């Protein structure tokens, strides 16, 4: 099992850490304008088309990682 930040809704500063279902093999962080998402995710869905369609977001950037709690907001907050 992988631990990821997983907030049910987009929010600033997602601190909600969870032990993801074993089927989730990656952690996702995505910024879609004002909406920032942090989820338990899958690599098969770590592509622009799958992230946009599934979060129903027209434009965004995303990042997937495989270490516990890796999907925090460092990349956004350091900029």
Which DSSP string corresponds to the chain?
--EEE--SS--SS---EEE--TT--EEEEEEETTEEEEEEE-GGG-SHHHHHHHHT-SS-EEEEE-STT--SSHHHHT-
Q: For the domain 1-79, what is the CATH code? A: 2.10.60.10
Mention every residue, 6+ apart, whose C-beta is less than 8 A from residue 79.
none
- Delimit the domains of the chain by residue range: 1-79
């Amino acid at each position: 099992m992988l631990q990821c930040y997983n907030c049910p809704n987009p929010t600033a500063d997602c601190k909600t850490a969870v032990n993801c279902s074993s089927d989730f093999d990656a952690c996702l962080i995505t910024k879609a304008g004002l909406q920032v998402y942090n989820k338990c995710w899958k690599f098969e869905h770590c592509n622009f088309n799958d992230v946009t369609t599934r979060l129903r977001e027209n434009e965004l950037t995303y990042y997937c990682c495989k270490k516990d709690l890796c999907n925090f907001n460092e990349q956004l907050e350091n900029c």
